[PDB]
Design a binder for this molecule. Structure first.
Ligand SMILES: [Mg+2]
Length: 673
DNA sequence: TGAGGTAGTAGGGT
RNA sequence: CCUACUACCUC
């Protein structure tokens, strides 16, 4: 059925409906010299849009502006990664822009963004950075300070009305010159900024160069930039590249959490949701005060409390860790090997037992083996592994002191090559460090292929598969996928074959390889699948996949999941509740999969039903439950549903180790967690 | 390498 | 929007 109904506020504020003049922006035409180049045209126009000044943005192969064509710089010259271009703008009249047409709507909103940006630029006595305005001094420290404000946004809606988005944020500013910053003691400025203006850079190094040798220190003097400041050492900055000689005294370090890391105290940049809601309401009211588009009106929305997930081990469990005592769901016979990289010998008693306590409490048996080779023994080590694999060892638990990145990846790849997933557990280890080692054991077992916990319930889709791209914007250069159920997890790696196969073939490739591995492990071929992707890549990339599912007669649902851009969700009454579903413009909605502390504010996932007929609540419900099926955590659930959280980790590990043909590892052994 | 969350910054004329 | 890292917490 369905439960709960609640009302919430979105960190959005409704404003004045667009007036006739805005709905029909002026349409300018751009002429370049020399011609751009097939791929350089779009960004080049964006650049002319800025160069021409005013509330002007790119619309198609030209600009669209809200500023009178007369105030814009109709001619000029701009450079791009070398070549410079002369531009010409020809008013081509006015063009209505239907808000109902997402695509045209995309331009009015772009203009709304430029309009909002323009007001901040003329704001007095407030630090501005893009669409963020910082209006209050929060924390402090030697030479540095922290400002508080909000990242802002403005866009036109379905209805054709303005929308203001406000999300509180903190900014880190240095109040000390690079010369004085180094004096103190601090080191590396990744980027830096002119003490006199705002152009940020990426200082390369400090050159032991020429006092005043035309002139460097004179140039900065031919402007007074240097009067009463003491240009220090020769510093070569950078831009997105010429070496632009400079003085470390006319530069200000751009700090990160690091610089201010070691600190003048603990530093909490997170906000409990009420304080967060409080500042949003306030700043929204403050900006609307000088935006002149009416009073911002908090948009409310209907929310629904989704039914909690029934996480089942052998008995009922509240989190994965608890199955170590209750027993796991179904459990195979298994064997694990211990590999000690320090100087100790066997299995730590409390570990031996915990495993023993977990397995006995479960059905089947376990055997603990101990490898007696050392990675350095080379070939003797490999035969030792081949030999462990022979007697049935399924996964290796590695006790060792913290390992350097590359040593770590070398040991894992080496073991993986002999068909052995491994789990590292850092050796200075006490029995009281319950969380750390119990988590390690959860991983080891998962790597062994054991289904520690499963979902007890009913779901539209029998198989759920998450996809992640090998090239960030497309599956052109391969990628990975993972699938959860019965519910037994498995990974899928692309068909090894190189270059640029067609994207949709790579995708369909992933899905068919997943549909197969499922069958050879469940003996059955799912009747309905839930497909999950990130939204980063097009969608037409899943076309071959979709109708392939058409021929085999299996039903589907394509749902995209965004980690951010979901804004914020606050109740009108009561406390933030877990398992919150919030419908928006349709085919899309919000989901609050977690809320686990009160020193922070939850970040809703934003989803889009891009294909399929299953009802949105039904989608929300399942995607929420998939969230409790990650095996490697045990003390806290991920925000992303298991399938996507797993695939990303798989894509990460693939790159970190150097996987091509993981040929001896079973597909239900989550070697990558 | 224990791992999850919320956050801030790097990153996609001199 | 995505990644990366970092900090801060939490189990
Ligand atoms: Mg792991």
């Amino acid at each position: 059925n369905h439960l709960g109904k609640t009302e919430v506020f979105l960190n959005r504020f409704a404003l004045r409906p667009l007036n006739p003049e805005e709905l029909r922006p002026w349409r300018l035409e751009v002429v370049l010299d020399p011609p751009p180049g097939r791929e350089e045209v779009y960004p080049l126009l964006a650049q002319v849009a800025r160069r021409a000044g005013g509330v002007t943005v790119r619309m198609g192969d030209g600009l669209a502006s809200w500023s009178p064509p007369e105030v814009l710089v109709l001619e000029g010259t701009l450079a791009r990664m070398g070549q410079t271009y002369a531009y010409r703008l020809y008013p081509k009249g006015r063009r209505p822009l239907d808000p109902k047409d997402p695509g045209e709507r995309s331009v009015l909103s772009a203009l709304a963004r430029r309009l909002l940006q323009e007001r901040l630029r003329r704001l007095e006595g407030v630090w501005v950075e893009g669409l963020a305005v910082y209006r209050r001094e929060h924390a402090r420290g030697p030479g540095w300070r922290v400002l508080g404000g909000a990242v802002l946004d403005l866009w036109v809606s379905d209805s054709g009305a303005f929308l203001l988005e406000v999300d509180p944020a903190y900014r880190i500013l240095c109040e000390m010159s690079l010369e004085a910053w180094l004096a103190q003691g601090h080191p590396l400025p990744k980027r830096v900024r002119n003490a006199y203006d705002r152009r940020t850079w990426e200082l390369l190094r400090l050159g032991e160069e020429d006092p005043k040798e035309l002139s460097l220190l004179d140039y900065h003097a031919s402007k007074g930039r240097l009067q009463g400041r003491e240009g220090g050492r020769v510093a070569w900055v950078a831009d997105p590249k010429k070496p632009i000689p400079h003085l470390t005294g006319l530069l200000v370090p751009v700090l990160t959490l690091e610089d201010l890391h070691e600190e003048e105290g603990s530093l909490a940049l997170s906000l409990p949701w009420e304080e967060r809601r409080r500042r949003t309401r306030e700043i929204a009211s403050w900006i609307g005060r000088r935006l002149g588009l009416g009073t911002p009106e908090a948009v409310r929305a209907q929310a629904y409390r989704l039914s909690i997930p029934k996480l089942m081990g052998r008995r009922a469990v509240s989190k994965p860790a608890d199955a170590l005592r209750v027993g796991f769901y179904r459990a195979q016979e298994t064997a694990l090997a211990l590999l000690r990289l320090d100087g100790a010998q066997g299995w730590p008693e409390f570990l031996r037992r915990a495993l023993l306590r977990a397995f006995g409490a479960s059905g089947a048996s376990l055997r603990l083996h101990t490898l007696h080779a050392h990675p350095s023994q080379g070939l003797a080590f490999r035969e030792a592994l081949r030999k462990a694999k022979e007697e049935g060892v399924q996964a290796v638990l590695v006790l060792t002191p913290p390992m350097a990145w590359e040593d770590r990846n070398r040991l894992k790849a080496l073991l993986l090559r002999e068909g052995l997933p491994s789990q590292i557990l850092n050796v200075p280890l006490r029995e009281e460090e319950r969380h750390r080692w119990e988590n390690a054991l959860l991983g080891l077992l998962a790597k062994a292929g054991l289904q520690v916990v499963a979902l007890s319930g009913a779901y539209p889709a029998e198989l759920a598969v998450g996809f992640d791209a090998g090239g960030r914007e497309s599956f052109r250069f391969g990628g990975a996928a993972c699938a959860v159920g019965g519910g037994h997890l498995l990974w899928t790696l692309p068909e090894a074959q190189a270059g640029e196969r067609i994207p949709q073939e790579v995708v369909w490739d992933l899905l068919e390889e997943t549909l197969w591995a499922f069958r050879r492990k469940a003996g059955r071929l799912p009747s309905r699948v839930l497909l999950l992707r990130n939204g980063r890549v097009p969608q037409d990339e899943f076309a071959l996949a979709l109708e392939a599912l058409a021929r085999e007669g299996i039903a589907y649902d394509l749902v995209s999941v965004r980690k951010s851009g979901g804004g914020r969700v606050y109740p009108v009454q009561g406390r933030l509740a877990d398992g919150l579903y919030v419908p928006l413009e349709d085919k899309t909605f919000l989901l609050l999969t977690v809320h686990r502390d009160f020193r922070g504010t939850p970040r809703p996932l934003k989803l889009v039903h891009e294909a399929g007929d299953t009802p949105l609540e039904a989608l929300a419900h399942q995607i929420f439950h998939l969230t409790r099926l990650y095996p490697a955590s045990g003390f806290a659930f991920p925000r992303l549903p298991a399938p996507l959280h797993l695939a990303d980790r798989l894509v990460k590990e693939v790159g970190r180790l150097g996987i091509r043909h993981l040929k001896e590892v079973d597909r239900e052994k989550l070697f990558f967690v």
